[PDB]
Structure formats: C-alpha cells, structure tokens
Amino acid sequence: QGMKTRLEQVLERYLNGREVAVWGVPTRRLLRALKPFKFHTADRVDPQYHYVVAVTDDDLTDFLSDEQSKSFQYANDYLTFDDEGGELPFERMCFNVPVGRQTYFGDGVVGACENGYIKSIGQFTSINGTAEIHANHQLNMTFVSDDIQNFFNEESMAVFQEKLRKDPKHPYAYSKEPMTIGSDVYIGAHAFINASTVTSIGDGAIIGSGAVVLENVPPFAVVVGVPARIKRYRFSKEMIETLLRVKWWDWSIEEINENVDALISPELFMKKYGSL
Amino acid sequence: KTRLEQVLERYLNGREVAVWGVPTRRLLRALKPFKFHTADRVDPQYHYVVAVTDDDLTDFLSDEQSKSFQYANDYLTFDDEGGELPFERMCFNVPVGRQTYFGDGVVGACENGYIKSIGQFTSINGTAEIHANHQLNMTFVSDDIQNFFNEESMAVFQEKLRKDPKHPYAYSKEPMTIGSDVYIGAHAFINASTVTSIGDGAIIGSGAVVLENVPPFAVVVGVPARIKRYRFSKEMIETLLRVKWWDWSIEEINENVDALISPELFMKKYGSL
Amino acid sequence: MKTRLEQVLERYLNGREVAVWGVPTRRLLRALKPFKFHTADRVDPQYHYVVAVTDDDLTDFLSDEQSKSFQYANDYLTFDDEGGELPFERMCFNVPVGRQTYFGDGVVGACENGYIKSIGQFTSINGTAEIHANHQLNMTFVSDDIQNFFNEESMAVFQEKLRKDPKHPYAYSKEPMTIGSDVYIGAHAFINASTVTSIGDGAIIGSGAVVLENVPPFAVVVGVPARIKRYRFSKEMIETLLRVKWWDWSIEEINENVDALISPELFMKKYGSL
Ligand SMILES: NC[C@H]1O[C@H](O[C@H]2[C@H](O)[C@@H](O[C@H]3O[C@H](CO)[C@@H](O)[C@H](N)[C@H]3O)[C@H](N)C[C@@H]2N)[C@H](N)C[C@@H]1O
Ligand SMILES: NC[C@H]1O[C@H](O[C@H]2[C@H](O)[C@@H](O[C@H]3O[C@H](CO)[C@@H](O)[C@H](N)[C@H]3O)[C@H](N)C[C@@H]2N)[C@H](N)C[C@@H]1O
Ligand SMILES: NC[C@H]1O[C@H](O[C@H]2[C@H](O)[C@@H](O[C@H]3O[C@H](CO)[C@@H](O)[C@H](N)[C@H]3O)[C@H](N)C[C@@H]2N)[C@H](N)C[C@@H]1O
Ligand SMILES: [Cl-]
Ligand SMILES: [Cl-]
Ligand SMILES: [Cl-]
C-alpha cells in the first residue's frame, strides 16, 4: 500500500542495471522503497556500477564533500531520500500530485500534497521550504476542533461529516476543487496559502515573504502583506496573455537553450512572440 | 514522564513493545521498564508497536500488519510528544486535555515553564511558536552572556530580572493557560512574557502575532494580532462557559452531537431559558 | 572548513576519548576520524568527552546522573547544532561568529550560501528566523533551477545579467550582510539577503518582521514590512556604546562592570562622554 516514492520514480528511470549504494544510516521507509532493487551500504562508489542514495540531507552534504562524488551527476547518478519536495529534470508525482520539471518545495506542501489540497504544481516553480498550506476547520458549529471526531460513534460521525460536505466555505478543503500552483511561481519564506479558500495560484505569481494568501492569485501578480495584496504585476497585460499562450515553461531543453535571450530579456520576448 | 510512558502505563497490558524503526537512546531509556524487541511479525494480542519517527509510522500504517492496530490502544509514535491522545495527559508537567495536539515549539514552551495547561479538543498548528522576551531595560539584550557571569554577577542579574515588571523569560507572571476548543494557525506567535491566557474557543489566525490575552471565542488575525470577529454572540459565550462541553464524557458528546453540530440547537437546549 | 565540533575538539578534548551518546551518523564519523571514539557507556569527564549526536540525544544525556560532572563545551557538545553558542569566537562554515551567539539552521544555511559576512558577539537569533535572497525579477522567468537545463552558452548570458543586475539577485554584486553584537531576532523573522547589508549592533528584530533594508544600531524593528518602532537607548548612548564596545570585553571586564551592564544609567555615569 506504500505510495510511490520520489526516489522510486528516479530509480525507475536512471538506475540502469546498477546497484544502489546507500550513503548513511538506512531507515525503515528507505528499506521499504529499496526492496525491488539491489542495494548495499556505500563504501567505494563508481557511477558505472552504483547509484548513490543519501538518506538524509546531512548524508548528502557528506557525500558531496567526498572525492568519489565528483563523477556523480545529480538525479542521473545520485539523489537524496528524505527530500520528497526536491527538484527533478523530469515531470514527477508527489504522492499523486503532478509536479513539473525543476520545481522544488518543502515538507509543509509535501503534506499538502498528501492531504489532497493541491491538484498539481507547474514547471520551474520555486517554493521556500518554510511555506505552509493548511485548510480551515468548520466555522459554523459549536466546536472548532477537528479531532473530537475520534470520540464520535458511527451515528455521530454521519451527521458531522454531512454538514461539512455542505459547508460552502469548504472546511478541510471539502466540496472544493484542489488548488493548482502554476508554472514559474516563486513563494517566499513563511508564506501561507489557505487551502479552504484558494484554488488557483496563477502562472508566474510571486508570493512575498511572510504573505498570507486567502484568495486566488492572478497570473504574474506579486502579492505581499498580511493578508496578501497585489502590489504589482510582473509584466504588462499583453505579455501576460502572450505568456499564457506561448507557454515557455513547457518547452524542450533544446528550445529553452534556443530562446535563452528571450527568457533573459522580456522586451526581446515581446519582439519575438507577441505577434497579432 | 514521556508521552509513550503514559500510554504504556495505560494500554500495554502485559504485552511486549514492538519497536518499528531504528531505536534512539532516549526511546531505549523509556522502554527500560518493559520488554521490547525490533518489530518483525506483530500481533496486537502480543505486541504494542512503537514507531520511532513519524516516517516510521507512515511505513507501519501502510503495512498489512497494522490493520488490527488501534491508535494509542495498540500503537504510538515516540517522537510525537505533542500528538493527541484519547485521555488527558501531561506534557512534561503541563496538563493537556483530550484530542488536543501541538508542535515541537509548544513542546519546548511546556519545557520552559511557559504554559500552565492546555485544554480539551484544542488544535495547535505545528509551526506555531511560543517564546518569551529577553530583558529590554538593561544595557544588553543578550541572555547567554550570563554564561560568562560568575556567582556574584548573576546574583544581581537574576535579582533585577525578577523585579522587572515586563516579565523577561516569563518571570514573576503566571504561566499561560490555553483553553479548550482553541484553534491556532500556522506561523502564529504568542508572547510568553505578555500573554497569560488564550480563552476557550479562541481562534488565532495563521501568521498572527499575539501579544496580549485573547478573549474566549475571539478571532484574532494580523501582525500584531487584533480581534476581527467573535465566534458566537455574547449570550452563547456565557452559556458555553457554564456548560463546558469540552469536559463532557464520550457518552454526552455523542448524545448531544446535534447540539454540538448546530449552535442554534445548542442555544435552546443549554441556553438560560 | 572545520565543523563546530571539530573546532571544539581541537581546543578542549585534551587527550581524552570522545564518547558518542547516540546512534552515529556518516558525517559524525567523518568528523571524528582524527580522534579516538567509541560508543558511550560509563563516562567520566577526566576520561571522556561526551558527544551527543542529536538535540534529542543531549536531553537524554543531561537527564542521566553521569552528566552532573560535565560542563558545557568543555566536556560535552551536540553534533547537529552548527548554530549553537560557544564560549569563544568560532567559525560557522567560514563566517566568524562571536562569543555566546546562537542561531538556527536557517541562518546556518545563510552562512553556507555566503549571505553573511560575520555575526557579532552575544547575539541571540531565534531558530525560526530566515535569511534568503531574491531571484531575478527583471527577466521573463523567476526560476533559478531552470539553469539546470541551460547549456554552457546559455548559462553565460544568464550569469551575465545576474552580475549586472543592480538589485542583487542571489546576493550578487553586493557585500555579504553584517550582523552586529548584542542583537536579538524574534521567531519567524526574515531578512532579505538581496537588499540588506547590515544589522547594526544592538538591533532588535521583532517576531514576524520582514526586514527589507538595513537596520540602524540599537533600533527595534517590527511588522510586515519591518519599520522602526523604537530605539533601545538615547542617541548619545548609542554613540557611547559604539565606542566602548562592551561586547569585545574580556570575561574579567564583563564581571567587573556587571552593574554597568545591568543599569544603563550606571553605564552612562561611568562611560558617558565628558
Ligand atoms: N542554495 C541556494 C538556493 O536556495 C533556494 O533554491 C534551492 C532550494 O532551496 C533547494 O531546496 C532543498 O532545500 C530546501 C530547504 O532549504 C527543502 O525545502 C527542499 N525540499 C530541498 O529540495 C533545492 N533542492 C535546490 C534549489 N536551487 C533558493 N530558492 C535559491 C537559492 O539560490
Ligand atoms: N492531516 C490533515 C489534518 O491536519 C491537521 O490535523 C492533524 C494534526 O496536524 C496532527 O498533528 C501531527 O502532525 C502535525 C503536523 O506535522 C504535527 O505538528 C503534530 N505535532 C503531530 O502531532 C494530528 N496528529 C492529527 C490531526 N487530525 C489539521 N488541523 C486538520 C487537517 O484535516
Ligand atoms: N530555553 C529558553 C531560552 O531559549 C532561547 O535561548 C536558547 C537558544 O534557543 C538555544 O538554541 C538552541 O535551540 C534553538 C531552538 O531549538 C535552536 O534554534 C538552536 N540552533 C540551538 O542552538 C541555545 N542553545 C540556548 C539558549 N539559552 C531564548 N533566546 C532565551 C530563552 O530563555
Ligand atoms: Cl475531517
Ligand atoms: Cl536566564
Ligand atoms: Cl544562480
């Protein structure tokens, strides 16, 4: 019943008949994910024969200081286990939340993926690890608690859950669409997005540090403050829609390199793609 | 007395602890008064499974063996001092009511003597923080400078700290009482030097910085925290404080679930008249 | 690049054996390779330097009755605590940190990213404080890891605009930030490494404050964004504090002026300018 690890998705694509070399104190969840593969505790490693798996980020710090690590490419030959939110060169799943290329995030939103709060996360999105995404409890009852249900019997729970499924303010993200976090998004430190009231973080939206987001963010909007407010937009409204049609975040690696000057210069991006 | 110890004193029932995960020195110290082993084949009739990390419990509950293990009754996580429980428990020496949970920041607050008790059915976000102020009336704001103080220098340092009316390090003030039916959001902050109570039913929004007492059933948001609304009318707040549903038995909670679900039904039933 | 533990063992081990309290990690064994270590059992400070692997391991040790004879730093230390205070000036990565100054893992990462030039003495930084920089905001994209798809030539142009940018994305083309002495920083506080270069001596950053520019010495900043609430002392006292620099005193001098450090009024009647 174990969900598919981020490590499992990498090994499925890059192990290539090698043996996994565990770098660090192995854990029960790691051993569980490493069952269908040949693995051993790492000593002397070779990218021809071994794929290095550092258990903790502390273990990766140790591996990347070692001389043997210089022959190992990120993702292609090594990876960290305890980093479910780490970026990848391909489109992955987090639990069952699709996550695009070069998109990383922390543990608060990994849990938000587990809670069914997020529908999907786009490409090239940078989310600070300390960002958090939680829902609201019911606000229309005599109690605000959630774990009182542990004391509810079958009859008391049927009538509790029935009201939640009808609450139009979506407690615990009920009866609402899971939120989509677009591509080219930046989320600052200590940011919070209410999962009960937000369904869309637009493409290109920039959420400032310490911002509390209670509503949808328009595409390429910059929001700051408690509560978050639109301070500026990244580009004009004509480039905003042109961006939403050109969709550079879905290019190939060869196309990204072939349009580097357009990605580096928004003015040149317009002179190249803003055809009418 | 650790949280695992309080459960094992209650629900182990002569079984043997099954350690799901790599054991730590502190867990090995707590499991000393019982027999234990590394979990392989587990049966809830023979074993109480104890997951070391939250990552261990996730692996255990996804195993086909956990299908007959009940929460707290048959299993528990050791590195979850702030996890909820079906009976009133102690966090260090801070009482905590039933179905109430918090994070490690609040755990350290309990350890620092900042909290007097935490009520029933209270939901505290793990990223919530509770710290006190340093001394602000002296030439230095540092605390660890006292590590360079000798026996005579700290006699006068500690002397003025306890005289300080602003309660540096929560000095000369009652510890903080967090009521029942309380909700506190993520990244919230409560100042242990200037806050003595969070009322019953109080709701602290995410990202809110609480510097003064929150009234019962008040909804506070912002930096600093300010009251945005009250949960119920004044009359229901009076009756909610006389009834105290959070102290009901499991029986009364299930019997009056209709009153717990609808505030208006609660009002006619337990209201004054 | 010595660790916090390596710095302490080179100075206080004194021919003893390090006794490891807890399950040893890969990075701890590597730090302990030049020393004589073994699993802790029965420990004596005349014989052993107890090393606790995790914060959770040290709590277990100090509750044990064998810890009653050990002293902090001199006789025991925690491994996973690069931001923990020390009774001497230390090096976090390659960032000088003053005596009795502590921070959390976010600021340790800020030292690793080169965002911090130095951190003063007797500075108290909450563990949930953060110091991150801005990505480029004058481009078509805000991503950083998109550069993992950049080839050799595209990387050149990208890195070129970054060093040209006057707003200092990723703290480029700007001086690393200085954090003064006798500074306090509340929980959940954030300092932008792209636009800040100095946290003045004696500054106080209140909880939840978003500091977007330099904080003067002895100013108290709060809010989102952070603005000056008050100053700890008068303008004349700040100027005397900046010349006296009590945070550079010897342990003897600190005790000899414990009355001047406790009462600001006594500090001025003794060090105030003529
Ligand atoms: N190191 C400096 C960089 O840090 C961040 O990016 C980096 C992220 O912080 C990294 O995040 C990793 O570390 C963070 C915690 O710091 C974890 O939350 C996250 N899941 C884990 O993947 C991620 N793996 C790589 C990415 N380029 C900043 N957004 C940009 C900055 O230049
Ligand atoms: N999983 C989704 C739910 O998460 C929270 O509740 C849950 C709490 O977050 C849980 O708390 C546990 O997990 C949290 C988060 O990591 C820890 O901070 C906490 N110390 C630990 O005890 C607790 N054990 C169960 C409770 N239902 C939300 N308040 C409600 C939400 O529906
Ligand atoms: N316990 C109560 C005290 O907490 C803090 O200080 C304490 C610091 O928070 C401690 O910092 C340690 O604990 C913190 C918090 O977990 C970690 O962020 C930090 N890396 C770790 O070194 C440090 N080792 C000791 C110092 N007296 C307050 N600043 C003062 C308060 O009286
Ligand atoms: Cl629920
Ligand atoms: Cl103290
Ligand atoms: Cl870069």
TrEMBL record, chain A:
It comes from the Bacteria. Gene3D superfamilies: Hexapeptide repeat proteins (2.160.10.10). Acetyl-CoA binds at N128, N136, Y186, A189, S209, K231, R232. Keywords: Metal-binding, Plasmid, Transferase. CoA 2 binds at N136. CoA 3 binds at K169, Y186, A189, S209, K231, R232. The keyword Transferase applies. CoA 1 binds at N128, N136, Y186, I187, A189, S209, K231, R232. The keyword Transferase applies. SUPFAM superfamilies: Trimeric LpxA-like enzymes. Mg(2+) binds at E254. GO terms for molecular function: metal ion binding; transferase activity. NCBIfam families: amicyc_ac_ApmA. This is Aminocyclitol acetyltransferase ApmA. It comes from Staphylococcus aureus. The lineage of its organism: Bacteria, Bacillati, Bacillota, Bacilli, Bacillales.
